[PDB]
Homo-oligomer: A and B are copies of this chain.
Amino acid sequence: RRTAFFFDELCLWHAAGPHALTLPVGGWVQPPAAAGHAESPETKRRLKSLLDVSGLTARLQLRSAPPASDEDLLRVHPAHYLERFKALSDAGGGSLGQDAPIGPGSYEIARLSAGLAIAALDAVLAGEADNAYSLSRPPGHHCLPDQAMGFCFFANIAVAIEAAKARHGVERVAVLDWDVHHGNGTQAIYYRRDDVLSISLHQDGCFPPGYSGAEDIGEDRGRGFNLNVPLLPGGGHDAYMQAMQRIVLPALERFRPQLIVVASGFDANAVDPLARMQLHSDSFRAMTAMVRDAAERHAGGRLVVVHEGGFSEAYVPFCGLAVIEELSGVRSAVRDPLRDFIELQQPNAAFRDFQRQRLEELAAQFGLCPAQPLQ
């Protein structure tokens, strides 16, 4: 298998003002002596470093891309938003919204991030690669057309899809969003559309705070083409496996995607500060295997994974490595040193059963028939 790795060093140079985790410094929040922000470069940089020393980068098709044009961005965002973003970026940065801080030059770098997503879809649709991974920083899946949120400043995946439709005329794209937070940007943009199936697995009520969203299934033309799976906080491997088998795979089976895009955050990992789920690297490996399989049966193998969240410096690299091994069909010598340990922390039988029953009920609410994958 030929996997394109879309990466640019410059995406790692985007940096907001001082923050303690996600809290803007000021008031009662003391400046951290080192850290600086949640959406730091280090988590993505360490993924890249581990890919290099493992020998995996040598086996991928390593690509960059031009930054997203105004044409591409305007399919989603209004000019006055671009202008506001740019002016704030040229004046040294600041706050572009609620939980949306930017640094100097962040406009240009956000454009580059969006271009990588655009290019990754283009490459896979054009037959240049079987699948692709885009290390797109800053992330995209919370961003609304006219409102930056959740450290996202462009709707990377939505911009990529709209560009893909204009260049290739793809008619059915599925977006599976396994970032631990709710993919509200993708949901809102495609909410009344049936050419895009948007599925979000997320921790119930995490971000946006208090939002579950199971009853939000899309409207009119898009009714049934948006699906939220609000998993109970504390869940791990089995919760995600059950969600995949009872909701995701049956939904993709019904939708028959010609392209699958994954909004892949790794903030469901067991040591992430920004959520409470218990995934290990093999959990992300298994989800990728399931989604790759779905792509091989419906979409001619056309799968793109776009990097979204994931805050843990120590553990994100191992989770992201697992995904890329699974996309490329290449297994490195890397051994996840937290794997066995995270196994022992998983929910007990009673808790697993309780989450399983809720997923069964949810699959029934959605009108998903428990069929088996086929071609």
List B contacts of A278 (CB < 8 A).
Answer: 233, 276
CB-CB nearest in chain B for A332: B28
Could you jot down 12 A-B contacts, CB within 8 Å?
A13-B49, A14-B31, A18-B36, A21-B314, A29-B314, A31-B36, A32-B314, A91-B94, A204-B348, A233-B345, A233-B351, A354-B354
Closest residue to A17 on the B side, CB-wise?
B17
- A315–B21 CA distance with the chains assembled, in angstroms: 9
Report the minimum CB–CB distance from A3 to chain B (whole Å). 19
The prevalent SS among residues of A at the interface is loop
Copies of this chain, whole number: 4
Given contacts A209-B345, A234-B235, A313-B32, contact A337 B23 (CB under 8 A): yes
Contact of A104 with B24 at beta-carbon distance under 8 Å, contacts A18-B15, A273-B272 already known? yes
Besides the known contacts A30-B50, A234-B235, 4 further A-B residue pairs in the complex with CB atoms under 8 A apart: A17-B92, A92-B95, A212-B348, A354-B354
Chain A residues with a Cβ closer than 8 Å to the other chain, count? 81
Q: Which residues of B lie under 8 Å from residue A236 when comparing CB positions?
A: 233
Residue of B nearest to A10 (CB): B53
- Tell me which residues from 10 to 62 in chain A have a Cβ below 8 Å from any Cβ of chain B: 10, 12-18, 20-36, 41-42, 46, 49-50, 52-54
| Nearest-neighbor residue (CB-CB) of A346 within chain B | B205
The answer to whether A15 and B34 have CB atoms under 8 Å apart is no
Q: Does the CB pair B15–A25 fall under 8 Å? A: yes
- Separation in Å of the A233 CB from the closest CB of chain B? 3
Contact mask for chain A residues 263-294; partner B; CB cutoff 8 A; 1 contact, 0 none = 00000001111101110000000000000000
Q: Which of A46, A209, A276 has the most CB of B within 10 A?
A: A276
The answer for the CA separation of A206 and B49 in the assembled complex, in Å, is: 29
A27 & B337 in contact (Cβ 8 Å cutoff): yes
Residue A127 lies at the interface, judged by CB distance under 8 Å to chain B: no
Assembled-state Cα–Cα distance A53/B346 (Å): 40
A173 is an interface residue with CB less than 8 A from chain B: no
Residue pair B17, A18 in contact (C-beta under 8 Å): yes
Interface pair B337/A232, CB less than 8 Å apart: no
Q: Specify which chain B residues have a CB less than 8 angstroms from the CB of A358 in the assembled complex.
A: 350
